[PDB]
Design a protein around this ligand. Sequence first.
Ligand SMILES: CCCCCCCCO[C@@H]1O[C@H](CO)[C@@H](O)[C@H](O)[C@H]1O
Ligand SMILES: CCCCCCCCO[C@@H]1O[C@H](CO)[C@@H](O)[C@H](O)[C@H]1O
Ligand SMILES: CCCCCCCCO[C@@H]1O[C@H](CO)[C@@H](O)[C@H](O)[C@H]1O
Ligand SMILES: CCCCCCCCO[C@@H]1O[C@H](CO)[C@@H](O)[C@H](O)[C@H]1O
Length: 507
Amino acid sequence: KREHWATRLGLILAMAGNAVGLGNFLRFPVQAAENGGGAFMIPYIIAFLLVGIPLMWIEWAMGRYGGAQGHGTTPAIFYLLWRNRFAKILGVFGLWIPLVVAIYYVYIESWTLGFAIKFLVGLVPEPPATDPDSILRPFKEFLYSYIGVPKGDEPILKPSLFAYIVFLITMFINVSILIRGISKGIERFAKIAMPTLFILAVFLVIRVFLLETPNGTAADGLNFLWTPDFEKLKDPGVWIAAVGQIFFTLSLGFGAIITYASYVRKDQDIVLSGLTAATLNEKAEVILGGSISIPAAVAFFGVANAVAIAKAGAFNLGFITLPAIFSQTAGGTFLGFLWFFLLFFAGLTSSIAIMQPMIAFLEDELKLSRKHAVLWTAAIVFFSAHLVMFLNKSLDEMDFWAGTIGVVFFGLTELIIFFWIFGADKAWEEINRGGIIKVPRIYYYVMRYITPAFLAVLLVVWAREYIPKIMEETHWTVWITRFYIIGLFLFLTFLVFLAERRRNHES
Ligand SMILES: CCCCCCCCO[C@@H]1O[C@H](CO)[C@@H](O)[C@H](O)[C@H]1O
Ligand SMILES: CCCCCCCCO[C@@H]1O[C@H](CO)[C@@H](O)[C@H](O)[C@H]1O
Ligand SMILES: CCCCCCCCO[C@@H]1O[C@H](CO)[C@@H](O)[C@H](O)[C@H]1O
Ligand SMILES: CCCCCCCCO[C@@H]1O[C@H](CO)[C@@H](O)[C@H](O)[C@H]1O
């Protein structure tokens, strides 16, 4: 009846693949540097222990629970968990979030593929020594020419022809994997991509470790992230930043886990498999990820400038700073190729995970073939992405409502539906059923009180500090993007309507 993962190992590597592309290498280093890396470890571990693990297991169980009844998607899974019309409209969010994220994410993934192509061939800017900004500016210009950034006032992006071609290639590659299916495509690619990612990261970590400059060494930069500033541990903002990173550490709230877990067999383990996968992502995020960006930056610019450059963001550190830092070292363009090849493969395992929920919806509810479901989903993403490519703050706008506010809000709804409405006793049985290991009794208290309290705190905080703080100082072109992604929610709600009408006719 339903597709299933062939092997336990490929399932875990596939699941681990979702979180890797969502800034695993870039986000964690920045959050630690802003909040004191050594000090930041304790909040990060508490959040991973009291938020990430419980929610991951909740998502795994909801996916597998729905997959037994033939549904991999939250409109139907919520309705099975909660027999109410409002659960179906709430489930639309769980389709909407991964779809909106995909609209701009695959485009960003294309940037790594294009940059990797340009670096491999050596078609990169070369700074002439040494001025911190004069090294950074020619690469900042390089990204802007690729994206088509205007002067600054204009809201129009003029993407390069090369960047458009690469976006098509990137989309075609996504389709090649997704069209093969769960085991022939996703699972086969994850068994190839994850080890390749591991070798590049380790290779990069060793290479970065050997970087030295009169401004500093890379070993000094590594020491900045493990020596604690215990005085910064008392700040509530560090705890707010720790919980938020965990969502990107494990790709919680994007719907990828649920849809993936729907192809887990009804009696297969989710307790050990999900715990292993979440451990893989955390180890890769801390060890491998938190050892390439910051240490290389500290070596070239010293500790002080590095924090000022780490405050420029995780994206400014990934496409401008690190390529400019590798630009000066021996074999540096090839190291930039490796860095960008790493990002692309990490993106590939993630872009296929957030496009699979829409593919599952068409198959499960509208009864489309995999071929048609993959192509139609590809068409919708490719078409909608023209908004992200040509409208200036459009990417930023989708990232906020879907990938920032949306995922955290949806994570709380998953908890309440499964553990409060569906029943905490029922949900506990569903989680631990078929488990190689069993969840400890303490997590029943955590999943029912601690985890929802932490999320509601993060939300109300992330709300008041982001949502209504500045609703008036955004340019008027943001309404274009808001109008479109609101139309997408109406489109999905109509499809859920059609799906019920066909299900009321198949009787
Ligand atoms: C395959 C479907 C094509 C849809 C066309 C989208 C609008 C065209 O897009 C433009 O194409 C030009 C070259 O063709 C590029 O130079 C421009 O960068 C790009 O903006
Ligand atoms: C692996 C393939 C990567 C994409 C290669 C296509 C690069 C498109 O690049 C374009 O090619 C044109 C020539 O036809 C030139 O006139 C344009 O200046 C150039 O931007
Ligand atoms: C595509 C047509 C959209 C029309 C835009 C809505 C009317 C303009 O609304 C604008 O919204 C901004 C929100 O940040 C405010 O800062 C501006 O003051 C306001 O003029
Ligand atoms: C913001 C919440 C409102 C978004 C638009 C929902 C209004 C449409 O209502 C929809 O009608 C359908 C009838 O079958 C039902 O399947 C859906 O559950 C219901 O949400």
